[PDB]
Symmetry: none
Subunit: 140 residues, 2 copies
């Protein structure tokens, strides 16, 4: 009984920290990380090599992504008849007001800005894990 978390992020530093914070969970989880919007969609639509990759229970989405940005990934996921139910938490350095408004308008479940202080960000990821992987009841 393990939940899968799909992290779409390219910053290796953040990837490391995020993976470390999620690793210190009270319940083991599976974290799959892809580094660009393209891979993100291919993985979620189980296209190609990602033929048998199981559906994630939670998606953590960075916005400024290579190839295809998070804004586009979000719009395509929340518009898809089947992927739209997967909770998406945008976790980004962006404090841009347009990004905030647009993300919620596209039905993102939640928007979180990456802290400037590593330890703070670490605690934020812990909050994400505790609330979504423990307190909330996820679909399916």
């Amino acid at each position: 009984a393990h939940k899968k978390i799909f992290l779409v992020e390219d910053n290796k530093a953040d990837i490391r920290l995020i993976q470390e914070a999620l690793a210190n969970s009270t319940v083991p989880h599976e974290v799959v990380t892809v580094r660009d919007g393209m891979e993100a969609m291919a993985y979620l639509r189980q296209e190609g090599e990602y033929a048998n990759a199981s559906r994630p229970d939670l998606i953590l989405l960075d916005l400024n992504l290579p190839k295809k940005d998070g804004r586009e990934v979000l719009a395509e996921i929340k518009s898809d008849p089947t992927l739209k139910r997967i909770p998406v938490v945008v976790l980004s350095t962006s404090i841009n007001e347009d990004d905030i408004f647009h993300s919620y308008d596209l039905h993102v479940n939640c928007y979180i800005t990456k802290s400037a202080n590593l330890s703070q960000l670490f605690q934020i990821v812990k909050g994400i894990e505790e609330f979504w992987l423990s307190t909330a009841t996820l679909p399916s």
Copy 2:
């Protein structure tokens, strides 16, 4: 169950001595050394070629390092949510009250003034080894 010690030192003479002082161990220790602060942080943050280097269980840090001093190394280590728990033993020749104050202020675990005579320095390293790698209960 072997212990991994990370030595940040540029004085080849001290490196040789410390290495030897840590060779005696029923369960062989894994000693890794780097000669400068830049290399130290890259290694600890698992950047690039160090992407797969395991986290040490103890760090021994020199202050007057090339291209990036131990002061900065200490601050960056103690501010990182994934490295801040690794015990850091500052082992330097400095007896400067300024270095002592700042090092403890930055959360160094302990500060040790190297002993001139290579032999006494040996007994000091043995003290470090017994207390930290045997007496204390490490987070690792």
